[PDB]
Design a protein around this ligand. Structure first.
Ligand SMILES: [Cl-]
Ligand SMILES: [Cl-]
Ligand SMILES: [Cl-]
Ligand SMILES: [Cl-]
Lengths: 574, 577
């Protein structure tokens, strides 16, 4: 019989576990870390096995400090739930004492850096998006931005950042601290992902293309772009597809974190440094040693030392639960047309082999299953399910060709990909029985699978799903454009690939989890689906929830959204 | 401030899992036949000498009443995933766990039955009729068609007696013959029959509930003559019961009666009162010369006890912590809109201050009652930090025929005023700091009835397995349930319409939580989907949980958790508001 209170207890601990991000080095030589829990967030100084809390009430984030600055700028929402933020300064020698920066009116704070002398940030109001500089003599608007924009780095008087200024791409920009203004460097056929200013006052940037990422140097004096050449060739030989973060360390070396196939690697002046398998955040130099953040499908975000990978700060889980979440691995699953589908697998320590296995389908579809911490997948492992996470075609992270294969073919090839992953789990000896679970586009897939491939999965869970493309099309500007694109402008594809037109074929129990009042995934089509299921005597469960937030932060959110799915699946295990 | 979810699940889990027992009879070689909720589902057991043996394999719904000593048991099991199309399965008491399906009986809604050992006699409902059946060597025979829901009470020789809801919410007595069939119906101008058993003299002894009192009568089935029955001890008559729960003749010819007043029952043999544990008792049987009954109370889950010692033969256990979350129970008489006094049980949470969060928990039926009897819902609420108020609105049993029959033709009328008065009482008495409403089946109907007709009374509502639309429900129901809907609404389509909460959604101003088993055929789902469309159309907030492969009669651990947990969670969240 299902141990319900165990599942809720575990889901509780996985939601509560503290999660850490590295922000920089301050106060001479202390780590600045932001720690997150149950969606609640604080700022800490770390040094030598101990933390000190800097803020009082929960915050939203902090600005990027320059190495060594004696203060930290907290960003905090001014109402509870509102886009308007205010800025609060804390001296690192007087933690817990906050001085509100009254010169900055509430607004949506998008990013920022604190040089120690000037606070430079981007913000959005009713009027505009702007770059601002706050110094001792008050607030100045350096520039108005033609879109959402983010400060990456300041060195001397030169400011660099990334802007979403049109054409579907991230462009690079620069400004001056003293004179302001804006210069935009267009990314051409790629997008800039990160930027840092060299001692030579060049902007080094990560340029992501259709295929392989490029490290480039951009001379801000003339807009010239050249591939950057590093003293060690490890980085180039790695052939990354994306660049997560880069920055110059105080001693002038360039730190870069790049990734491919859902895992990242750390490089210093092109030379690779050993790091724990997974994904890494920013790298800082601290008392002569290198420090980064780490996360994986089995490891909540934490701070590690390199190259040992020893944790400095990590949240606590009980011995019991840590052992439920075993290692993650990547496997390349072969699909119907021979194309290989990169699929992350998370093994449960609480399930034998072969054992119950969930194929957990990501939303988007323009998104990626990477080797990074996921409350959903971890909850499944804790409840005694292996989790299989396939990057079906349409996914990001593997080049433009793979992403664009979904166009005109929803519920076609990408379903074969998902189906091949399931097959792979059964025949590899991992799975004794197979389930499917997914949210948004993932829920659409779930319904797509149970209709077009009955007898493949034992049960399905569909969250925030879409049911009928044609009805959705006529009810939706932005989403109508998207639906047109995805279906190749074909009403025949809208109709044939809508699961509500094939309910008749479902042979397996289905669990629907849906928001009561969200215009993005509306409820009306789901009631029709439920009427159809009922009329045809199909087994189904439904949980309809008002006022769900689109991300699992708190225990409340988890209970509404995640818990019923895990319960349902545990009962299907009969 | 934040809802302690893991504590609630744990407590709810234990309160559902605790074993519960019901006494069904005596079989085989002087063995108790017991139905237990145990190991997570409803099962049938033989008890003898401090051990049980499980008779069935997969969970069952119930079993037929065995005659003393028969060598077999008839299991009743839903073969339609909750929709209550039942099939019958025979098990030889010497070969427990081996089931032979009785293929001559097509699936239908089994309402009751008795197994003489030679013939299985039962009542059932299909789409087109309610009937009395006999299954014997000659196959399946339809002894009679019944003009409504009907229940077999007893068989002695060829004579069959039972109770039938054959109109006006009155319960009549009927008889039939095993060999020849047919139907004879005996009405009372004074009241309703509640129970029946055939004497050795081939008279039917019956409990007759009148306006505000009950008593025992003898009915000669050869001429319909009714006489007050004279017992050798006067304890029973001095008790002045208001209702008669059960009666039966034991093998040695003594007459066993269980009668109640004010939500507690007493046991009588040939009129003489027998010491029994305070609460409510079920059937009495004679076993190894001693008397055995079932017992339950607001603090004691259903268990089997020996009388008069009251020593348990079978019971489940609760941890002390759970036991203490129920601080105390009491009966209070709440005054309603018309001066009628509404007997209302109150369960005070040990985990809530006074005044504190209080749920008005409305019982189903409506022909049923909140008594000093175990209630998983109520105990769960007390555990989660809610006082529970349980009003016996008009329509309830346990307080005379007049009180029961006031509901006829007036659903969502007076009985709502009764429920509303109880809520009022809890606030003004100092018990309640805030008020919630929660109910299942007719109780869920009342929840919807309250939130539509009395907005602003409750802070939030939970409606489980609810009635939504009497008309649509009428079209969807089987013979028996269609007849019953007719009776409750006084045959008025105007009442069906005006008293259906779906026609008043516009008036709802409070958060509503809907909980429904998908395959329920007493309270179907289809009208609920429409309600959800109505709520959505009218801009109301609500949450809904639809449970798969379950109908009205929840018989597993898993179904129970999925139906009860969301209710308690919802209410605890409404509290942190
Ligand atoms: Cl790891
Ligand atoms: Cl589990
Ligand atoms: Cl038979
Ligand atoms: Cl009364």
């Amino acid at each position: 019989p299902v141990e319900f209170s165990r599942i809720v207890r575990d889901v509780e601990r996985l939601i509560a576990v503290e999660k850490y991000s590295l922000q920089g080095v301050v106060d001479g030589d202390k780590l600045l870390v932001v720690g997150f829990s149950e969606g609640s967030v604080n700022a800490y100084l770390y040094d030598g096995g101990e933390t000190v809390k800097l803020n009082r009430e929960p915050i939203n984030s902090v600005l990027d400090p320059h190495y060594g600055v004696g203060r930290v700028i907290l960003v905090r929402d001014v109402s509870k739930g509102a886009e308007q933020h205010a800025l609060f300064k804390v001296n690192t020698s007087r933690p817990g004492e906050e001085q509100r920066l009254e010169a900055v009116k509430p607004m949506r704070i998008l990013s920022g850096v604190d040089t120690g002398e000037a606070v430079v940030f981007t913000g959005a109001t009713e009027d505009r998006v702007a770059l601002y500089a706050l110094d001792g003599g008050g607030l100045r608007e350096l520039a108005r931005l033609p879109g959402f924009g983010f400060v990456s780095d300041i060195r001397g008087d030169l400011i660099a950042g990334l802007g979403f200024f049109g054409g579907g791409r991230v462009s690079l920009f620069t400004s001056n601290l003293s004179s302001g203004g804006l210069r935009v460097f267009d990314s051409g056929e790629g997008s800039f992902s990160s930027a840092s200013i060299s001692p030579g006052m060049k902007v080094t940037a990560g340029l992501e293309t259709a295929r392989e990422a490029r490290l480039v140097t951009v001379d801000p004096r003339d807009g010239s772009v050249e591939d950057l050449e590093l003293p060690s060739k490890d980085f180039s030989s790695y052939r990354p597809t994306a660049i997560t973060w880069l920055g110059y360390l105080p001693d002038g070396r360039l730190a870069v974190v790049a990734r491919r196939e859902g895992r990242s690697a750390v490089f210093i002046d092109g030379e690779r440094v050993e790091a724990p398998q997974g994904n890494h955040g920013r790298v800082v130099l601290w008392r002569g040693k290198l420090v980064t953040s780490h996360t994986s499908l089995s490891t909540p975000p934490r701070i590690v030392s390199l190259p040992s990978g020893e944790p400095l700060l990590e949240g606590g889980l009980p011995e019991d639960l840590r052992r439920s979440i075993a290692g993650s691995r990547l496997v390349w699953v072969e699909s119907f047309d021979g194309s290989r589908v990169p699929t992350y697998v998370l093994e449960s320590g609480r399930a034998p082999t072969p054992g119950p296995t969930v194929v957990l389908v990501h939303g988007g579809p323009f998104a990626e299953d990477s080797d990074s911490w996921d409350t959903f997948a971890a909850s499944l492992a804790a409840a005694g399910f292996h989790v299989v996470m396939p990057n079906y075609r349409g996914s990001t992270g593997y080049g433009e060709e793979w992403r664009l294969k979904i166009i005109g073919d929803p519920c076609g090839g990408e379903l074969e990909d998902v189906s091949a992953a399931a097959r792979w789990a059964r025949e590899s000896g991992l799975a004794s029985e197979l389930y499917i679970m997914g949210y948004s586009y993932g829920g659409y897939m779930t319904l797509c699978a149970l209709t077009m491939k009955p007898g493949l999965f034992k049960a399905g869970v569909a969250g925030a799903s879409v049911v009928d493309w044609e009805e959705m099309y006529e009810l939706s500007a932005a989403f109508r454009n998207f639906i047109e694109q995805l279906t190749g402008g074909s009403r025949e594809i809208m109709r044939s690939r809508s699961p509500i037109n094939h309910v008749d074929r479902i042979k397996e129990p289905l669990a629907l989890i849906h928001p009561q009042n969200d215009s993005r995934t509306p409820l009306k089509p789901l009631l029709r689906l439920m009427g159809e299921l009922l009329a045809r005597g199909k087994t189904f469960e439904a949980h309809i929830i008002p006022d769900a937030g689109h991300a699992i932060n708190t225990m409340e959110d988890a209970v509404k959204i995640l818990l019923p799915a895990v319960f349902f699946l545990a009962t299907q295990r009969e």
